[PDB]
Amino acid sequence: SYQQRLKAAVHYTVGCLCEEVALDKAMQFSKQTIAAISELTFRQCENFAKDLEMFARHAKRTTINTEDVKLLARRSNSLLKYITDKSEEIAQA
Amino acid sequence: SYQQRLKAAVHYTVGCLCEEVALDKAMQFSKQTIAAISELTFRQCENFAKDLEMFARHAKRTTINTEDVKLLARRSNSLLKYITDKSEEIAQA
Amino acid sequence: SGFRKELVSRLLHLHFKDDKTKVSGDALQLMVELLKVFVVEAAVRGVRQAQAEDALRVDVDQLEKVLPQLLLDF
Amino acid sequence: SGFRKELVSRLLHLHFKDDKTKVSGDALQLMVELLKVFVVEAAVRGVRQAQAEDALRVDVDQLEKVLPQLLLDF
């Protein structure tokens, strides 16, 4: 099924990312916790997607840009900074 | 002091609003709780103000409009509905 | 009962990063309504929590339990 | 390690309300980064919480304690 396939793919990457962190921090994650972060990341995409769309059309555009994405990071200074860094690095290549 | 005056004015209105709710619900609020909701409402204005500004300039405007305000209510269907209702009622008069 | 336009305007202008930033009349009337719903939600959810815990009144402990979700909704 | 563009694109398009909606290449690359940070934050905060409680590993109980604030930050 289409969404199951997307979920599984998200779960796989979350698993990898968590394992990196478990190494860097010498602290393990239960299998349930990794699954929970996976569901969470999946749900979060809905919010990101919907917001991005509304932000785009608020600027009367149908195609989402990096300004829309930065807006998504607006709520935390350290996040906005990190995301702005990455966006320049992306506009570089 | 300027901000103290604003705060006290917020606190007064929060008190009135809470008292209405204490009546409608036959349940009382401690004085500390009313104060906490007041501080909270004050802090919330910062987020509302900053977001409204960013939403305005995202549409390349310097003056905030009702679309900016609706965006503020984007996250909950029942809220967006309530706020959209109110906005029409306001555009009526 | 509710917030006065002038109060809300002053509260908003306190935090604007740019001096050019202004707020339309309609937007300001809407913000008055939005702030009222915010406060009322806090109060109502606080009460529900107090009821759930079978408390006599809404104390700060009950309030704090409902804030995280309240902030997510706004 | 990280998310593939195609995965992210499909994830986003799942939720768009309008068929006209599209995502630029740069935006998509950014989204890839944003999602990675999201996951890493959840993981890192989960660990800190486990450490604070002096737990052996991160269980769902420790995770749930940090989610409300994590969601507020995003």
UniProtKB/Swiss-Prot annotation, chains A, B:
It comes from the Eukaryota. The keyword Nucleus applies. It is found in: Nucleus; Chromosome, Centromere; Chromosome, Centromere, Kinetochore. Keywords: Acetylation, Cell cycle, Cell division, Centromere, Chromosome, DNA damage, DNA repair, DNA-binding, Kinetochore, Mitosis, Nucleus. GO terms for cellular component: chromatin; cytosol; FANCM-MHF complex; Fanconi anaemia nuclear complex; inner kinetochore; nucleoplasm; nucleus. GO terms for biological process: cell division; chromosome segregation; DNA damage response; DNA repair; interstrand cross-link repair; positive regulation of protein ubiquitination; replication fork processing; resolution of meiotic recombination intermediates. Ubiquitously expressed. Signal peptide: none annotated. One of its GO terms (molecular function) is protein heterodimerization activity. DNA-binding component of the Fanconi anemia (FA) core complex. Required for the normal activation of the FA pathway, leading to monoubiquitination of the FANCI-FANCD2 complex in response to DNA damage, cellular resistance to DNA cross-linking drugs, and prevention of chromosomal breakage. In complex with CENPX (MHF heterodimer), crucial cofactor for FANCM in both binding and ATP-dependent remodeling of DNA. Stabilizes FANCM. In complex with CENPX and FANCM (but not other FANC proteins), rapidly recruited to blocked forks and promotes gene conversion at blocked replication forks. Heterodimer with CENPX, sometimes called MHF; this interaction stabilizes both partners. MHF heterodimers can assemble to form tetrameric structures. MHF also coassemble with CENPT-CENPW heterodimers at centromeres to form the tetrameric CENP-T-W-S-X complex. Forms a discrete complex with FANCM and CENPX, called FANCM-MHF; this interaction, probably mediated by direct binding between CENPS and FANCM, leads to synergistic activation of double-stranded DNA binding and strongly stimulates FANCM-mediated DNA remodeling. Belongs to the TAF9 family. CENP-S/MHF1 subfamily. This is Centromere protein S.
Swiss-Prot record, chains C, D:
GO terms for biological process: cell division; chromosome segregation; interstrand cross-link repair; kinetochore assembly; positive regulation of protein ubiquitination; replication fork processing; resolution of meiotic recombination intermediates. GO terms for molecular function: DNA binding. Keywords: Acetylation, Cell cycle, Cell division, Centromere, Chromosome, DNA damage, DNA repair, DNA-binding, Kinetochore, Mitosis, Nucleus. It is found in: Nucleus; Chromosome, Centromere; Chromosome, Centromere, Kinetochore. One of its GO terms (cellular component) is chromatin. The keyword Acetylation applies. It holds the Pfam family CENP-X. Its main location: nucleus. InterPro entries: CENP-X. Belongs to the CENP-X/MHF2 family. Heterodimer with CENPX, sometimes called MHF; this interaction stabilizes both partners. MHF heterodimers can assemble to form tetrameric structures. MHF also coassemble with CENPT-CENPW heterodimers at centromeres to form the tetrameric CENP-T-W-S-X complex. Forms a discrete complex with FANCM and CENPX, called FANCM-MHF; this interaction, probably mediated by direct binding between CENPS and FANCM, leads to synergistic activation of double-stranded DNA binding and strongly stimulates FANCM-mediated DNA remodeling. DNA-binding component of the Fanconi anemia (FA) core complex. Required for the normal activation of the FA pathway, leading to monoubiquitination of the FANCI-FANCD2 complex in response to DNA damage, cellular resistance to DNA cross-linking drugs, and prevention of chromosomal breakage. In complex with CENPS (MHF heterodimer), crucial cofactor for FANCM in both binding and ATP-dependent remodeling of DNA. Stabilizes FANCM. In complex with CENPS and FANCM (but not other FANC proteins), rapidly recruited to blocked forks and promotes gene conversion at blocked replication forks. This is Centromere protein X.
